[PDB]
Paper text:
Upon binding to the insulin receptor (IR) in peripheral tissues, insulin activates the receptor, triggering intracellular signaling cascades through the phosphoinositide 3-kinase (PI3K)–AKT and mitogen-activated protein kinase (MAPK) pathways. The α-subunit mediates ligand binding via a leucine-rich repeat (L1), a fibronectin type III domain (FnIII-1) and an α-helical C-terminal domain (αCT). To understand the basis of this aptamer-induced full phosphorylation, we determined the structure of the IR bound to an A62 dimer linked by eight thymine nucleotides (A62D-8T) using cryo-electron microscopy (cryo-EM). Our analysis revealed three distinct conformations of the A62D-8T–IR complex: arrowhead-shaped (IRarrowhead), pseudo-arrowhead-shaped (IRpseudo-arrowhead) and pseudo-gamma-shaped (IRpseudo-gamma).
The third class of particles displayed more pronounced conformational differences from the IRarrowhead structure compared with the IRpseudo-arrowhead structure. In this conformation, the L1 domain of protomer A is shifted upward, positioned almost perpendicular to the stalk, while the L1′ domain of protomer B is shifted downward, closely aligned with the stalk. This third-class conformation resembles the fully active Γ-shape observed in the insulin-bound or insulin and A43 aptamer-bound forms of the receptor. Unlike the IRarrowhead or IRpseudo-arrowhead conformations, A62D binds at only one site, specifically at the interface between the L1 domain of protomer B and the FnIII-1′ domain of protomer A. The interaction between the L1 domain and the aptamer is similar to the binding observed between IRarrowhead and A62M. However, the orientation of the FnIII-1 domain in the IRpseudo-gamma conformation differs from that in the IRpseudo-arrowhead and IRarrowhead structures. A structural comparison of protomers A and B, aligned by their stalk regions, reveals that the head of protomer A is tilted upward by 30° compared with that of protomer B, as measured by the angles formed by Q177–L459–V604 (L1–L2–FnIII2); 58° versus 27°, respectively. Thus, aptamer binding induces a more extended conformation of the head domain in protomer B. Although it is uncertain whether IRpseudo-gamma represents an active conformation, the proximity of the membrane-proximal ends of the FnIII-stalks (~20 Å apart) suggests it might correspond to a fully phosphorylated state. Although the activation state of IRpseudo-gamma remains unclear, its structural similarity to IRgamma and the proximity of the membrane-proximal ends of the FnIII stalks suggest that IRpseudo-gamma could contribute to full activation of the IR.
Author numbering:
A (entry chain B): 1 to 160, 169 to 509, 550 to 653, 756 to 907
B (entry chain A): 1 to 162, 168 to 172, 177 to 267, 274 to 519, 529 to 539, 546 to 647, 756 to 907
The structure:
Amino acid sequence: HLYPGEVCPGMDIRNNLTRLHELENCSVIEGHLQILLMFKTRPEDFRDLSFPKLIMITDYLLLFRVYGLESLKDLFPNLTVIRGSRLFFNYALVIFEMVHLKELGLYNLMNITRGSVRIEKNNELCYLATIDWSRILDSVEDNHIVLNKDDNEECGDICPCPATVINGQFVERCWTHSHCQKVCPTICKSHGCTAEGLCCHSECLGNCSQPDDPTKCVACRNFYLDGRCVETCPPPYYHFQDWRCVNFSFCQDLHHKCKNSRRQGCHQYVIHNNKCIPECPSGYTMNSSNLLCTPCLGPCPKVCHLLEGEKTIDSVTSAQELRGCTVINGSLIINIRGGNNLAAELEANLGLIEEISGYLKIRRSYALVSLSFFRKLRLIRGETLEIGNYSFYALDNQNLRQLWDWSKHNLTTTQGKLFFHYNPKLCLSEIHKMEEVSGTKGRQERNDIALKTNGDKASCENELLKFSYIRTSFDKILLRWEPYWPPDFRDLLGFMLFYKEGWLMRGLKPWTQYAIFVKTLVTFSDERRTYGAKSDIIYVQTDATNPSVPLDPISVSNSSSQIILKWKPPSDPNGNITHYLVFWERQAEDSELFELDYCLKGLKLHRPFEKVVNKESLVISGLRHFTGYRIELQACNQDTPEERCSVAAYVSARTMPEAKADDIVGPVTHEIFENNVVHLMWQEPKEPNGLIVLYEVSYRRYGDEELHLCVSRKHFALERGCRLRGLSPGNYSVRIRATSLAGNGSWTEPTYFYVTD
Amino acid sequence: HLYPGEVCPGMDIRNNLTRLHELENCSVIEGHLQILLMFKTRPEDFRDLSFPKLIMITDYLLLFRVYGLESLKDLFPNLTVIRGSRLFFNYALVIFEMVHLKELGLYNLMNITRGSVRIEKNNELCYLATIDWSRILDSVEDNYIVLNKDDNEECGDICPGTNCPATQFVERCWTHSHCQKVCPTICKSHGCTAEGLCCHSECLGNCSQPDDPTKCVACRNFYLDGRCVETCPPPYYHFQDWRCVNFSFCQDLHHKCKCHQYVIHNNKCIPECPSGYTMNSSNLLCTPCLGPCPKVCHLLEGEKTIDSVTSAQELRGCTVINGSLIINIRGGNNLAAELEANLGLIEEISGYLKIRRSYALVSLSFFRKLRLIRGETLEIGNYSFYALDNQNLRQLWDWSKHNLTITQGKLFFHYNPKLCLSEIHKMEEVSGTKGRQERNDIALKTNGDQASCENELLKFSYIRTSFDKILLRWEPYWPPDFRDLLGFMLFYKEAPYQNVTEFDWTVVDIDPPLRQNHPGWLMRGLKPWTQYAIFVKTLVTFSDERRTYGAKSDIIYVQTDATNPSVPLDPISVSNSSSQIILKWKPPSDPNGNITHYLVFWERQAEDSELFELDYCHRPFEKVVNKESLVISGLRHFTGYRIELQACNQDTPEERCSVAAYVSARTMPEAKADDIVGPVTHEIFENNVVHLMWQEPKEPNGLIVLYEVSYRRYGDEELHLCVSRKHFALERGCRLRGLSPGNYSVRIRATSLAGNGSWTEPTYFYVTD
DNA sequence: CAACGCATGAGCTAGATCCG
């Protein structure tokens, strides 16, 4: 058989050896195998337990802080291949800080598919250089075996194997003193092999029983199917974990196995391209029954589940299970007390909830002030009914003020009743604002909401405040409305205003939309006969001002005439930014750089526009080599009606210089004066990059030492060349070079000025 | 002028039209005067009228949201002198959130002695840039004309002339029908008429006749019987920095209004008494008082309002209250702190009291001297007490220090959710308002719900500080129900401060104790040598009644200990000379308490011999006490030295120091020391053989690569010799095997690697053949 | 039976009575 054993999940073992008993019959371990932090263990209990039927390892194997093992070949005698499906700490196999391991004993590995091996801090291992990872590890450039007992060649390293010649030495590669590393002829690289050199079936690996058979070798390459395995099995089975393919009847249960959210370590397995993949990627969503992923036309939502038909959310950690739940087949109850940073975390965990199919409870809810975080909720149909024929229930909402906006949202509901009691901040005209949208005036039913239980800490049960005038600026809005007077005008103490993203309210934001209304406050006459008012929920949106500068522009060159730019959008667009405007201008050369002798200490160191739209980069072309460019950035939001925008963002650029443009052109002319001073003339390269600053002349007699001369820019300018003093008669090999602002060019021919001896 | 009308006490204008014609018969105002919340009356109802019947007010002025006023000459068209002994906002004038006005009426007001000017938060207000603040009082830098809508000079302001004397802003003016009297800013506050100069000379505000000190309505020095002498001669006494009045006139000034009362004190016949001096109504002079003394404090009209955070009304020392008090302070988000800013010094309140927006305080302990309420003045609704918006108050006063009794006034317990009803019933009995059958309106549907006043403390049963963590355990706490225990919520945070708050603290929750076991907490990794403030609170189940049985352990400051120091940061050993090297570093990243010294070792590293023979042919220690530098000497040219460096914090009971750091650096080389020395002796022969004998360089200079022997001839090619170590050692220099005729010269320069030496003198030898 | 050894000390493996 190929794999006659049993499947085996990945586990973790720590502080004991009791949970290793569950490997009695399982052969292939998907996931990884980590055994760590085991201390009070004798070395003697390791010589009686064995696992002869373990072969396949998918992700990685990790041994860490083991006490008592001297040779792990007694524990893992028959594993051959490590798939390395998941790299662990950028490794596929790590043996670390082992205290007793005399020898490794891993004599059956043939091919590490992906990853590398790491052995560290093991002062007890030998034969570590007799492994020949190159024949097993397809990637040796990541091997890391340092600080072991073989740091010094002191542990023997004797063994009875061809003694391969992969390096320049006849290194003999053995695993232990009784086994060598098996190397057969390489006519097939990883196609399986026998002890007689007969290559087995092409699509399998490692040890083998009969050659050229895909049914009786050991480990194969791509997949596996019932004693056979082909590179791509037919699609009555869908590929699974890139090593198998199985009928959809198998893993469709696994989708239903943890559809009850008992463990978040699983995935809602989906079918996509004959891969029972955990999630079909972004731009794809799930249908109900077919388990195939829909192309997700436009933005689409994602799903999880609720808890036992009734899930209670106390804080964000309770709502963490409801992360990304779109449809909920049950009831829901929310009890939020408070915490830290309650601004947008509640809208992040459940800002994509689509539907709830039971009854909603807002009992004991105080930290909220509004239920606007069900932005995507559309319907509460409620198949199950709360006792008392209820489907909406709310008590003890001391600060709850706004249920939902019926201008920007449409609620619907079908059956059940409502309950609004002891919600003082919650008004009465607002709970009269849902029955037109929720439609409970239809299928007309007698709901039970008390007239007195709401309107406390406000006064709105009677009238509806009316605005009179609104006027919006870039940062402020005035709010003058119609004056409301109770029948006893002395009873009105004042007004209170709520706003969230006459009176002068000053703290606004450009291009931001707010919700505003006005609430009255009156006292109570000695009959329990209150008055009051609430204006309707009115949206106010600000206007557009000029944005800010484009943040942190950067500009790197990739050629002799190319600058590419990268910046950031301005912090406040203050409206839809249509485009950008970019100006670049040349900075020729710093003229004060002309007057320094550089061979003394070292180195001292309108306009065109481009309109880039809906982008954050720009490739500038047609530029001079090695010339500093100054770049101005405009982020302009509105263009057609007399465009306006921000202050320019300033950034500098330099083009990469050309290398050939610095060589001295032509032979360097020599002039011989009778007084042993010579005139060496050359012409400066016609297109310097920045500046040609120094000249390196090197006159040398063949067979004698060389003495360098620095020809300064001033000396070349004032004298046109170099007057080379102190020159004995005879022929000289003279090398001439011009040092520029970029680097060296090339030496000229050896300038031969010769006089016959 | 000349005070032609009668003197009147304070007044206030509210909510009506008929009462806007009263100051036409009052000339001197002694008391407060305010106009605010003008909502019942519409713009058209107001009337415009000018009357020269007002010359002085002795207290502050305030405007706040007046709807429908079109000119300020309607009530104050002759007001000349304003100064107050009782301040409000600390300013003599307060213009706040007023709207629907486009012109003023104070074209004569130019005397300001007491208080400053605050022009802030004024919407739709004009004529605030056609006023020379350097003319009305001291120049603009002492006045807060900010937060307004005339800081940018809004509205079109028309000043007559563009009569108006020589000066949005077109001229200084206050009304379309009246002009600001403008004169050089040198007068500053001396005031002036329309003459382009100080009114008379040293006047203050305005003068009836220019060039006469007698007719100064007020002057910068004290006025006495037609003069403005610098100080008041006896028996006259100083009177508000502008008058001299004798003791009889000092008494007669206030006896006439029988208002404000003036007493002789510090030669200042001013309306004041020193601290804790009550009143004796025989001459209304200051008389000594003991204990809680309300002394001088204006409570006329039997009521007083507080809508400011700072004012000179409840800080003078007026403990006993004979009037009413209403709190309407604008701005902020905690009236509990706003209330404390006004009544911090007063601990006994005999008048009207109420609290709103209780926060940052759970119990009241600032009213421990209140033990009697008079109620002689009737309170609004006969209620001397209101309770409302008490969402943070958990406990009331004790009944061994407060001992309040109410002789007139009624109770109001509404919207007190956090306070439990146990304290509420104690109020009714101690105050005895329910015991006087006086009607108390009590709302226990909104009170005694969501309440918690059980604040039992827990004590840390057993604690352990360690160098980086601290174990803490507290006694097993069981509320009245064993099931009613949701564990504990220990709050801790690093707090080397001895004044730290928990309202701004990492929280750990602890399982309920075994039903035992001591519930405790061990921190999981902390900075060594750090102080931590730790406390527990018991988390318990709350019933539908919301009755709290939890406990709250107190804050404990327990400090983790120190550990080994961190390495001396940035350890650099660089050469400063050929024979000395220096080591430099920085104090440890984690000093772990006081540093006692820096443990630093060093030693010499030599050069191996095979470097020389290559041709190309205990340990010394230092102790650095709280210093980041090390200098060592006695070193050799071009020699490497490794220097161990550590940092220590404690060395008396144990050697606890940072782990070692090593820097290996070499002293600078001596290039000149490679120069050839020693007698260059020649053995010249006639068979083209010359024996060369030059000596080794003066200094070893590290490895010596070779010896450069360059024997040359003038007219022939130059020949170089690479004298190896073996060659030099065996030949005592060099020998010339085969030569050419002529006087040869050889320059010798030994080649080492310590820099490069210099070519010695060319030693001539005449080769012959 | 009252620091250390049979880890390290906040870099996918626990979190300092975390283990005895």
